[PDB]
Structures are given as C-alpha cells and as structure tokens.
C-alpha cells in the first residue's frame, strides 16, 4: 500500500514530464502507436498514387 | 457453362459502366467501402479538432 502510493505519484508526474516534452516538440500533431501510423502512412501512399 | 460464359460478359460490361460512372463523376477521389470511410471521417475529425 505505502508503495504503490509512491509509484503512482511518480508514474503521473513522469507521464506529465512525457505530454510536456510532446507539446513543446509536436503541439500541432497526435500521438499514435505503431498500428495508427502504418494506417496513416498507407492512406497518404494512395493519395499520392491519386495525385 | 453456356450461362455462365454470358454472365461473365455482363457483368464485366456493367462493372464498366460503372466505373466510368465513377470517373466522369468522381475523378480525383477513391472509391472506398463503408469500414474505410469511418476510420477516415474519423481522422478528419481529430485533425479538426488539433486546428
């Protein structure tokens, strides 16, 4: 119990550290995992073939 | 084997027909079934919502 308090406290502040790091870098985009951006990479792929 | 040789004519002819439907129509855009159109409505939206 004492420790999972700590860790908890520690995970949050490390996640905000992570999200303030994203903003500074990357305001204007979206985080995506590795499935979302294949998924986007090949949609821009059949725009170009349009294009 | 008589039918079907018939058939198969047809309906290559009217999938034709409607492709050059979509041409004269549609002639810059992709067709895409209604799964794809979802996840791209969606995408639209979250782009929306970064502006």
């Given at each position: 119990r004492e420790?999972?308090?700590q860790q908890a406290d520690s995970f949050k502040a490390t996640r905000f550290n992570l999200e303030?790091?994203?903003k500074n870098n990357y305001p204007?985009?979206?985080?995506?995992d590795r499935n979302e951006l294949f998924e986007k990479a090949k949609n821009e792929i059949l725009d170009?073939?349009?294009s």
């Amino acid at each position: 119990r004492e420790s999972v308090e700590q860790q908890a406290d520690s995970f949050k502040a490390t996640r905000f550290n992570l999200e303030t790091e994203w903003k500074n870098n990357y305001p204007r985009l979206r985080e995506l995992d590795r499935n979302e951006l294949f998924e986007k990479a090949k949609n821009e792929i059949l725009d170009e073939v349009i294009s």
